[PDB]
Amino acid sequence: DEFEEFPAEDWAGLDEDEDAHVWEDNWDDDNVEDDFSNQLRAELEKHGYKME
Amino acid sequence: FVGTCLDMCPEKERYMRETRSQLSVFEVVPGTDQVDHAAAVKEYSEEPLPHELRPLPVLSRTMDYLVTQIMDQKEGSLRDWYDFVWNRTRGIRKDITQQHLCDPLTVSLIEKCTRFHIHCAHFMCEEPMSSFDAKINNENMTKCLQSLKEMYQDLRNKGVFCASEAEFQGYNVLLSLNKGDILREVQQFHPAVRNSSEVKFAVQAFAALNSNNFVRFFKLVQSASYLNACLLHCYFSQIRKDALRALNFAYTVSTQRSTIFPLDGVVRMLLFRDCEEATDFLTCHGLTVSDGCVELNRSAFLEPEGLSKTRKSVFITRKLTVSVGEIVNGGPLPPVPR
Amino acid sequence: TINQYLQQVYEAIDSRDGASCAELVSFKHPHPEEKCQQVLEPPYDEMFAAHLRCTYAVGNHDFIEAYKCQTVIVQSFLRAFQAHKEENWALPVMYAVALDLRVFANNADGDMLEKAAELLMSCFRVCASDTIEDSKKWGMLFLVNQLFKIYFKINKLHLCKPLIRAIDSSNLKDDYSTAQRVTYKYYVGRKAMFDSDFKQAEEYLSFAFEHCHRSSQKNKRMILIYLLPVKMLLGHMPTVELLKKYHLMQFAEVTRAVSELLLHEALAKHEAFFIRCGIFLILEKLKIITYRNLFKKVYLLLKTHQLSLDAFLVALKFMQVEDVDIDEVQCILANLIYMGHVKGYISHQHQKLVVSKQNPFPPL
């Protein structure tokens, strides 16, 4: 796992490429209806502590 | 060059000790003057000729006589006991350091000396400045653990294992928690060493430090052995400050109210001896512990400085049912060496 | 065939050429002291005689003699390069003497790697001294990229601090060769992921990820392997498309487990992968942000301002994490309060956490 050196010493600004939208913040939202959250919907509502 | 020394004692240096009057009061004949020819074991002050250096079986018999009788007696003052045994164990370490002969029995001579250093890292903490000097003790301990770390690599590449290999690697991890480089070290252990019982205990202690999980630290220190518990006495002034800072921050409304925090829970999470140590510990920091419960206020809390002297934490010396001699040996003792 | 080599090293000195290094001295082409000492001056020709004797040593595969060769090569070229009086034209020759004593310096099996480290530090302490055109410090960034690469494999990087601060304070910091500019703050981002400096690693190695050549398709992957948990601890997690395109699918379910124990199962299903690259203990520190996301899943499921601690106790009790009780759940929440992830205060008299209502807890 050694960082091998580059074939070219110099390159222009258009030589590199990216995927534009990678590191996004859309996950901090209010989606409750995911399946894993349904599974906890058993366990928090099996101990008699239930709320909407 | 190997030696042919066949004596417990120096053969010449006891006479120079007797003339120049630099004796140790623990090992003399009763009635001063004469040196004890039975026990006047080597002082540390190229190494020439086959005196002043001993081969491995004589030196092993020296370590056996050191562990069976010398560390058990409480005769004399407590000033020179640590100096006597520390100087002689450092003399043994200097002896086999430049002798350049290695064996699994030689590793046990490192093991008993570093167990003595772990035991004296807590027991002699109440000694006043000139007698103990804990800085040079913590300095001396890390050379032993570094030499043991580099020593275990050599026999592993040779192709022989040891039963006591995975034990002190846990103590190597418990030595350096404030240095974050050591995680790279725990990516470089052997898989059988890494998947053992006590290295994963050390991972739990390192996770208890950096996540500041003080509940799974003092509850973790009660589930360990004696030496593992008394090595963690250096971090008690760090954990109990990094834990109470969050607990004097997370209970207030802005900066100006008081959260009445009751007693017998602070001694339950933070491992104190009793109420008497806890009130003295929280009075000096700047908050109020008087009357019924512990006060909490943001503005009336400041960082400490100056004298930060420690005590013996009581709970870690409760797990010392066997005596002082058999801890650094491990299990039983060989009886009557002569 | 020797006379052509003597002619091209004579024209190397006479015409002050920089391509003559790639012509003779470099180990990229097809490759007796008394003859050169007859024809040339001693600091300029001991290079060539040593080079003949250690190409002979490599030609029958002896590495210790070639190691002593390249020690003599770097020392004699250091003495002849101080015997230059401020010119730039030996700086191409500076390139092929340090890189070739990295792969021959690694292969002598450690202490030989520390020996190569100190004798190459002796090269840097003479190279970084003297001096806007005639400056002998243009290859210095080439030199400092090697001193990370020796120091990382030996695992004795206890103090690298004055070696970094000397070149961090520099007038020419934004102008070098851009191939060596990528290879520097990659290692600075390594030293910044370690000992808890995660923002510096993110900026200095996101600069590397935004750049670099697309021809070598191993550098971009090796950046990602060591890039991803920096931005998982910072918060801004990858998408599915980059992991699909670059075939890096081990972290992806982990990026599910951070999003909503599933984390321990996902870590232990590929337990032998993060040990090899040295990621595994860094990845355990995401317990705080996964507990904060579990706090989000509790807060959106029950919808009030004051929540009782027994529900979070049950939610930790499903996880099969050992020795979790009522005092442990009360501790992590105060750590979330102090570091600033979760606003509010832990009431002890009612055992209920009152949270703020305008913003519940800040985003990242």
Swiss-Prot record, chain A:
Its main location: nucleus. It is found in: Nucleus. Signal peptide: none annotated. One of its GO terms (biological process) is mRNA export from nucleus. Expressed in limb bud, craniofacial primordia and skin. The keyword Nucleus applies. It comes from the Eukaryota. Keywords: Nucleus, Proteasome. GO terms for cellular component: cytosol; integrator complex; nucleoplasm; proteasome complex; proteasome regulatory particle, lid subcomplex; protein-containing complex. The keyword Amino-acid biosynthesis does not apply. Component of the 26S proteasome, a multiprotein complex involved in the ATP-dependent degradation of ubiquitinated proteins. This complex plays a key role in the maintenance of protein homeostasis by removing misfolded or damaged proteins, which could impair cellular functions, and by removing proteins whose functions are no longer required. Therefore, the proteasome participates in numerous cellular processes, including cell cycle progression, apoptosis, or DNA damage repair. Component of the 19S proteasome regulatory particle complex. The 26S proteasome consists of a 20S core particle (CP) and two 19S regulatory subunits (RP). The regulatory particle is made of a lid composed of 9 subunits including SEM1, a base containing 6 ATPases and few additional components. Belongs to the TREX-2 complex (transcription and export complex 2), composed of at least ENY2, GANP, PCID2, SEM1, and either centrin CETN2 or CETN3. Component of the homologous recombination repair (HR) complex composed of ERCC5/XPG, BRCA2, PALB2, DSS1 and RAD51. Interacts with the C-terminal of BRCA2. Belongs to the DSS1/SEM1 family. This is 26S proteasome complex subunit SEM1. The gene is SEM1. The chain holds residues 17 to 68 of 70 of the full protein.
Curated annotation (Swiss-Prot), chain B:
Isoform GANP: Component of the nuclear pore complex (NPC)-associated TREX-2 complex (transcription and export complex 2), composed of at least GANP, 2 copies of ENY2, PCID2, SEM1/DSS1, and either centrin CETN2 or centrin CETN3. The TREX-2 complex also associates with ALYREF/ALY. Interacts with RNA polymerase II subunit POLR2A and with the transcription elongation factor SUPT5H/SPT5. Interacts (via FG-repeats) with NXF1; this interaction is not mediated by RNA. It comes from the Eukaryota. Residues 48-338 are annotated as: Interaction with PCID2 and SEM1. It is linked to Peripheral neuropathy, autosomal recessive, with or without impaired intellectual development: An autosomal recessive disorder characterized by early childhood-onset of peripheral sensorimotor neuropathy, progressive distal muscle weakness, atrophy in hands and feet, and gait difficulties, often with loss of ambulation. Most affected individuals also have impaired intellectual development, although some have normal cognition. Additional features may include eye movement abnormalities, claw hands, foot deformities, and scoliosis. This is Germinal-center associated nuclear protein. Signal peptide: none annotated. Belongs to the SAC3 family. Widely expressed. Up-regulated in germinal center B-cells in tonsils (at protein level). The gene is MCM3AP. Changing M124T: In PNRIID; uncertain significance. Residues 137-320 form the PCI domain.
UniProtKB/Swiss-Prot annotation, chain C:
GO terms for biological process: negative regulation of gene expression, epigenetic; negative regulation of lymphoid progenitor cell differentiation; poly(A)+ mRNA export from nucleus; positive regulation of B cell differentiation; post-transcriptional tethering of RNA polymerase II gene DNA at nuclear periphery; protein transport; spleen development; transcription elongation by RNA polymerase II. One of its GO terms (molecular function) is double-stranded DNA binding. It comes from the Eukaryota. It is found in: Cytoplasm; Nucleus, Nuclear pore complex. Pfam families: PCI. GO terms for cellular component: cytoplasm; nuclear pore nuclear basket; nucleus; transcription export complex 2. Its main location: cytoplasm. InterPro entries: Csn12-like (IPR045114), PCI_dom (IPR000717), WH-like_DNA-bd_sf (IPR036388). Residues 182-360 form the PCI domain. Gene3D superfamilies: Winged helix-like DNA-binding domain superfamily/Winged helix DNA-binding domain. Keywords: Acetylation, Cytoplasm, mRNA transport, Nuclear pore complex, Nucleus, Phosphoprotein, Protein transport, Translocation, Transport. Required for B-cell survival through the regulation of the expression of cell-cycle checkpoint MAD2L1 protein during B cell differentiation. As a component of the TREX-2 complex, involved in the export of mRNAs to the cytoplasm through the nuclear pores. Binds and stabilizes BRCA2 and is thus involved in the control of R-loop-associated DNA damage and transcription-associated genomic instability. Blocks the activity of the SRCAP chromatin remodeling complex by interacting with SRCAP complex member ZNHIT1 and inhibiting its interaction with the complex. Belongs to the CSN12 family. This is PCI domain-containing protein 2. The gene is PCID2.
